[PDB]
Design a protein around this ligand. Structure first.
Ligand SMILES: [Mg+2]
Ligand SMILES: [Mg+2]
Length: 476
RNA sequence: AUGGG
RNA sequence: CCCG
């Protein structure tokens, strides 16, 4: 987005800190080229002449403005996509009660009880539990108030910046490219959930190519479903974006909200409203306050869904802007935020599409390494989605999500103190799909010290997961 | 944060 | 814990 004002106030906002990621017995062994993002203005690993505070905000390099024409084309695209979505999900989009919004519903997890609460709550020690009752799903007075203000389109707030504490490729660490998290007020999350919760649950329950969304999928079971679909197309593209979330422009965001979340579709009227407040935001970094236009903050209830919907719309728009006669079935896709797979029997020129995405502020490039541009004829077994390949399970015949050994090695090499056992068990569910040899190599460093689930047991688990009759079958 | 799983 |  575009930073329209870096104001400065004494009232400081504490984030800094050391990393919670400690190396494991495995690191020595795998020597990953990844490490914990720099979290300190002066980390002893930051290339000379780097200012975290600098790099970290070097993502706001503008807010693309659209012509009346391009805007009119984008509104058609969003209306065309909204027609498809809601035709599939239905129009059962009524607001959630505060109870439903808190405790979740079929397809929508419960709000989280002890995560950051946002502001001004942060500045008083207060936590969500001191504001909300996740037991019965009722809210305390401050939140009661905020809501009535929101119902009265009169509520203002600020995002709170955290430096994401995660593992990263050394080159990005040594460059100060640490990612940031925007924590919204816990009441904003509540009210979004209220306004767009049931729609969301429906999105999750109907995840798939038909709506172009994989939010709520479970790769273990759904890979087979996703793979067979995309395997039927002549062309598949692994399209990458660059700072997708930050480069959504006010025009696009505003127009999407207006077309997809209309009352004619059964949404409360403040559905559009609460979403729009995401367009221009104030971020609080330590002592600094910062106004931005464009982009989408990371911790908004519905960030992944919003992103996914934009992603679908961008593709329709880019294509319509270059070709004639493009409709929703000229192609197929599924996305999860910025992550996307597209496919078509038409020989679409994504390379040519590149300027059209540019009109929206979006830069696309091919996942396929830094290759010489988009090419034709790629297959589903050539792409990555959610950091997983689609490989054929040479046993069940089913697709399975295979992660790159390198990635698993970086994953296994670092861990929060006193979380290693559970981390190992959880990462083993990812690694099983790399086959028994790679599975055993990956975990040897932990042998004799931690409990490593047998490859065998996780394979049996996965078969029953992916297809119980497959499982039941292996036994007839 | 988010939201999935 | 892991992915966007
Ligand atoms: Mg990307
Ligand atoms: Mg990709």
């Amino acid at each position: 987005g575009l930073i329209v004002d870096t104001r400065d106030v004494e009232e400081r906002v504490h984030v800094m800190r050391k990393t919670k990621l400690a190396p494991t017995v495995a690191h020595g062994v795998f020597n990953p080229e990844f490490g914990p993002a720099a979290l300190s203005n002066k980390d002893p690993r930051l290339n000379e002449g780097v200012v975290l505070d600098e790099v970290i905000f070097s993502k706001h390099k503008g807010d693309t403005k659209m012509s009346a024409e391009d805007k009119a084309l984008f509104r058609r695209c969003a209306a065309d996509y909204a027609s498809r979505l809601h035709s599939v999900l239905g129009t059962a989009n009524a607001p959630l009660s505060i109870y439903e919004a808190i405790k979740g519903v079929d397809g929508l997890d419960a709000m989280e009880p002890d995560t950051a609460p946002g502001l001004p709550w942060a500045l008083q020690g207060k936590r969500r539990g001191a504001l909300i009752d996740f037991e019965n799903g009722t809210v305390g007075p401050e939140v009661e108030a905020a809501l009535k203000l929101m119902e009265k389109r009169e509520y203002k707030f600020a995002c709170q910046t955290f430096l994401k504490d995660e593992i990263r490729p050394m080159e990005k660490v040594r460059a100060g490219k640490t990612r940031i998290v925007d924590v919204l007020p816990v009441e904003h999350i509540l009210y979004t959930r209220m306004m767009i919760g049931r729609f969301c649950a429906q999105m999750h329950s109907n995840n798939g190519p038909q709506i172009g969304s994989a939010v709520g999928c479970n790769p273990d079971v759904d890979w087979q479903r996703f793979g067979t679909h995309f395997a039927q197309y002549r062309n598949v593209w692994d399209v990458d974006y660059s700072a997708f979330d930050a480069n959504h422009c006010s025009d696009a965001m505003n127009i999407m909200f207006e077309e997809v979340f209309r009352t004619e579709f059964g949404f409360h009227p403040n559905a559009e409203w609460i979403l729009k407040t995401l367009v221009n935001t104030e971020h609080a970094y330590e002592n600094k306050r910062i106004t931005v236009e464009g982009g989408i903050p990371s911790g908004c209830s519905a960030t992944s869904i919003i992103n996914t919907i934009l992603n679908n719309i961008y593709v329709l728009y880019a294509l319509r802007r270059h070709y004639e006669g493009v409709e929703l079935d000229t192609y197929t896709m599924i996305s999860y935020g910025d992550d996307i797979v597209v496919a078509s029997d038409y020989d679409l020129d994504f390379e040519a599409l590149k300027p059209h995405f540019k009109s929206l502020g979006q830069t696309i490039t091919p996942a396929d390494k830094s290759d010489k541009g988009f090419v034709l004829g790629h297959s589903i077994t050539d792409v990555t989605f959610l950091k997983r390949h689609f490989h054929m399970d040479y046993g069940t015949g089913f697709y399975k999500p295979v992660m790159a050994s390198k990635t698993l090695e970086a994953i296994l090499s670092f861990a929060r103190r006193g979380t290693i056992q559970e981390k190992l068990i959880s990462v083993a569910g990812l690694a099983v799909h790399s086959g028994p040899d790679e599975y055993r190599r990956l975990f040897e460093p932990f042998q004799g010290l931690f409990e490593i689930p047998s490859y065998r047991s996780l394979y049996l688990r996965w078969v029953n997961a992916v297809c119980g009759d497959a499982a039941a079958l292996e036994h007839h």
